[model samples]
Target chain A: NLPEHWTDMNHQLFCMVQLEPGQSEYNTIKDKFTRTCSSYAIEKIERIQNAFLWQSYQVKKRQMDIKNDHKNNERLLFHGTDADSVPYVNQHGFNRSCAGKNAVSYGKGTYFAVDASYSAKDTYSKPDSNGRKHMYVVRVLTGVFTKGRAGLVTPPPKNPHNPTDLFDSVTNNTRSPKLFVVFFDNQAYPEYLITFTA
Target chain B: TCNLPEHWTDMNHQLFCMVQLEPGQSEYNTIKDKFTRTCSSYAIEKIERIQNAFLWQSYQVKKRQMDIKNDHKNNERLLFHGTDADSVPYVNQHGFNRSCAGKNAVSYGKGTYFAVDASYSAKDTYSKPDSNGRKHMYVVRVLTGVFTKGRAGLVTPPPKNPHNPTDLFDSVTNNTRSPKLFVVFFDNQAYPEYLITFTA
Candidate 1:
């Protein structure tokens, strides 16, 4: 839950409501999270309820979905970060500075794996001193995108015919992407935080 | 030095002066070269010298403070901030608003961001075109002294003196590679030096 004013952007605002094991939301999120990678033991899933962040995502989603005729780019994606970095991300959202600390096969951008396994690797979602790992089910704005290459800081122009028009985001492969990368700050919001033992 | 054109005086409502660079001027050529090399995909329309004395005074004060407290590395460099056309006037007058850092991605930190390469900000994601189909990018001077890799949610640089905690890093950088991106939490840590208008 967030305060009524919530104007202080510096302060972290969010209440993680943990879902009970048998809860429907918990079961649904757990199923999606472990579908591609079920090796990790189940811990708990806390729904991130940052009203300001969710509102921000809704506004952007509406703009892309209704405005500019770029529709259906919003999806729930997975992001794995170090245990120490999870609080920062939960507080201020993702920063491009954290883009490619370990992996840059696609591009040096904020990567969100389509499959939870890709993000569950040791390179990402690093374990803490206690061996506990963390990851998020983030809502991303993956508007019109194309295949990305190595070391790309930003997305390339849509194409030759549409050089003036640029893609909203980038992915490893347009055909079947395993990861999605975005450059804008408001393009993604962390919707769920999952703590587990890998 | 080339002076402002006779007819092109300061705007009545604006706090800063915008002076167009001449073709033969060295500043003009250097900026043009950088634009061509990094942002060749776009064509330059014009480049304006942002003359904001008040902002400069504030930046100098910030630099002096950093010099004393943080052992000021004097690591100032020309950087780029891709901006919307409508926001140019505001940035030119008040400098960058670090508060708006979250409006874009905060991959590095939640602070005002700058790009070492013109190509990064030249994208539509940043350099949005106006109703007149013109895009603008600011050539800025940033103090990136003793920067380290930033992560999400960093409000300010880490403490240089962990015990005393009075001294802190001047800035945060995305990388130290060919084209480094910098982020500064301090408002006056950056000064808009030039406004480059181009066609997408």
Candidate 2:
């Protein structure tokens, strides 16, 4: 027997699932956020459950996993956006067209960072009028990435031997990349939303 | 010493047996020619035939059901599926997952996607590398019968007859005229026939 609210389709489709303390998902997000960006005080975290969006993302991930034999090389990275766009991101996902709105040094694609503080900066995650800030814990499929340059829109191909098949993503450095950029919208998913105070 | 069958190599912690195909063997040459023809950009290091008794038995059961429904017109086709090392065992044990669709691209439908071209599956988006830089894909046997063009938000194929609820399309594809990719919603509609290791 499920609760009446649990059985509601609209609720499941539109609402965000709030995770409480002691829950593994909540604890993991909190731990990662605190461990990476200690300066921001945690307020609340909500798991995005936009059915269509999530289902699309899951399908893409499973496809990649099947294609690469589980070598999809997914990472939990951070993306910072204005407070106004939080709802849109939760519902529609990160827009690749809006990539250069923040930074394009890594190409004109949506940028993500291994370090949470890099996204929490005022330049990216602008403070709302009320002085509150927000960030997303995004799941990015950064497979076979290459060094990114400023002018490129999509990742360059893997040389002549593989001229047709292009690299999956672009990063600041090939060996030890802290920043990643993806051109495809479905390549990344906004998994968790965090509203914190700087 | 790990006791195993002759010419059989234990892989993924003894979950299954994988034997490398000898060069010039019929099956080996067949797979090699396909790889060289369609996926020429990629260099095949080896082709290994995998054996999973339990998974094969389950697949047989699915084939029987399809046989009964379609009157032996299983519409089986050899296709390619991109996968990573961690997912290989799961796919080997449980067959392809229908529910896990929409992880990469859901343009056709929320179903597992299979490519006709090995090179397509060998791309980084599909055949991503592991910690050791090894990429993997499977030569899969798919039952793609009477496929229709697919669009977004399709969890399953539409009913063949709107009034008859049970009748539905066999599968969906990105294109109909020349469908290079197909998507299946049934978990057992596919069988992992062989594993191809390559570098792209």
Candidate 3:
């Protein structure tokens, strides 16, 4: 599903390309990437280079989510509508780079976060769409916390009431079983985790 | 410079929407068998952000390589990477950071966030003070108020007069106004010593 050792493009460049700014151009060894009239191939290559990476990223994230959803904030709670409006300490603990506020139990907070946005995946233009690849349409889930996970991903559900519900499947903490909704041209219809204190 | 194509022709304002329809429902129909199970709108939207980071970086690196190859093909040493021989660069290692910086410092019960010209100054910040003969960094745990921006859930900002909900809203169009950027006074914050104490 995923590479045991993720191949880093940057590291490869460092080890091979090895260009030192002012020192300039150091292709002591010319690889296939640097052949004659590569400029033409490059023109054609850039097209798929971006396409491949983007498609790769997509496949990778999907791979990441499926494998790590239980240990990471990979699923969404569809939290658009506000909760009872009374927030809790667990909600407070989730607002950091990594989960767990109690130092000893950081990221062990009550409510956890998931990936969410306002639009669908194809709502924007395609990668080959001339100038831009995708639109930076909506911003969701405090990215600040994306780096350090607040808590482990809840395991997949055993017997989900609604099979479509990814988060519902996992049974971990004292998590409340629920999905919120947020809507347009109407009231709250979009959804989020039930533990959301909003 | 947003095109905002279709220019409000649709009731959805030509904005990207998380439709409630199924695989056979959406008029957009980007891919077949997509809407079958009706994936959560929240999940769909977040992936775009991932694309934003992934695609953008991919383009940059690829672009940089092309530019270097096309321009510096025979320059002897084609730099394939940025200068950093020791620690692994984030862009090279963990991909890009897409999550927003949940406000740096905020207190709900009784606290607030502040930024000053005297920000994370050299005098106040150090990389790793592994050995301090007589000093171990100790911070005061304020047991702050509440969180204003919770991804799963959040608390409303303390109201000016307690009348407004002051809640942060994450919306499709509300966030995608693609609005014009106006002028605002600039005041940079620095000091690192000012961080809210986390002393155990």
Candidate 4:
């Protein structure tokens, strides 16, 4: 289910493709993904001077995120919250969440963990007197080799249990399911955990 | 002893300097000839020519510098585009090299570069099928990165260390402060390297 913001927000989605040791479909997947997603406009702004100056502005914003926040970091998640402390619901589709879906596979000995959270207002603004909170969830994921790795590699329940269980189940059951494989070289048993909401 | 007055107006001659002279055999002719032969006209022309040449030379040098600066800024933007998140393999064309005199030479990664290209297309409206075409410039930043998983999933929280904060933040208990290390890169010649600034 897509997030509420995504339904209204016209933004482009990008994916990275990494090949397995002997995999041959890596390039094909990458090509197909790029072809499909390139048409999706990530950020829309007013065009100026007969030039797409807004694209540069958007790029600069992304660069700021990369330089100050997103390099060498795993999932950068964002979520929306309301003044009533309730998370913003996806309005486009009923019973749908706006959280992004996993578009790629995590190899053996490598696990994907999402670090998600919500913000009351814009991170760069002064406190609003109205206190109308805006939810911003960043998907922060890391490999098993990185910190916060232990929490992600822990095996979750297979059957549907609680809300957390449902979240974990849905995240695990993606287009390409992430498998838990044992690696002897590193003596590490890696498992992937996907987080949708914080 | 013959003594000349301090100023030209003080000269006591038979014909006053300010008076109009008669046709043909007038004193104006003689004065005009004397003044022209005294190197004043040559000096004025020479000064004007020199000033014009200097101004032209200065303009040329400044124009050249401006062009060079613009090219440098564009190159830098292209380099950043190659490494940005939106960069794809299909758009990868230019490459950059960084040499370290004696040490290890650094090279930019493939498919990591951004560039701005412009195009002209016909403007169409409901009334006109194809009106006058105009040129349009589009700036696209290209680069390859982990765009799918890494970029989409993460909650960047306020850092424990204020100095090395993770991202821009605003708090209430402790006065809201903008994060440092905010960088924005563009194609402005004035700032060729990187545009790093703070925001509240």
Off by over 4 Å in 4: A1-76, A79-127, A139-141, A145-198, B1-200
Computed on C-alpha atoms, the DockQ of candidate 1 is 0.02
Residue pairs in clash, model 1: A95-B106, A95-B107, A95-B108, A96-B106, A96-B107, A96-B108, A97-B107, A97-B108, A185-B104, A185-B105
Instruction: List model 3 lDDT by residue over B163-183, tens digit each.
Output: 433322211111123311111
What's the lDDT for candidate 4? 0.22
Model 1 CA deviation exceeding 4 Å by range: A1-12, A67-70, A102-104, A160-164, B1-200
Each candidate's number of clashing pairs is 10, 28, 51, 44
Give the range where candidate 3 chain A is weakest over 10 consecutive residues by summed lDDT. Answer: A182-191
How is the predicted docking of candidate 2 categorized under the CAPRI scheme?
Answer: incorrect
Please give the CA lDDT of all the candidate structures: 0.75, 0.74, 0.21, 0.22
- Lowest lDDT 10-residue stretch of candidate 1 chain A: A1-10
Each candidate's interface RMSD (Å, one decimal) is 13.3, 14.4, 15.7, 24.8
C-alpha DockQ of every model: 0.02, 0.02, 0.02, 0.01
Chain B alone, TM-score, model 2: 0.86
Model 1, B106: alpha-carbon shift in Å? 17
lDDT of 3 by residue, A65-94 (tens): 443444342233322112222121112211
Model 1 Cα lDDT, one tens digit per residue, A1-198: 344533444554356677888878788889998898788976889877665456545555665675346567887899988887776677557876556554556665688989989888878888889888888999899988888877665666656564434577888888988889876555799988988887
Give the alpha carbon lDDT tens digit for every residue of B57-114 in model 2.
Answer: 4445445545655677657889999888776765665567654454557787877899
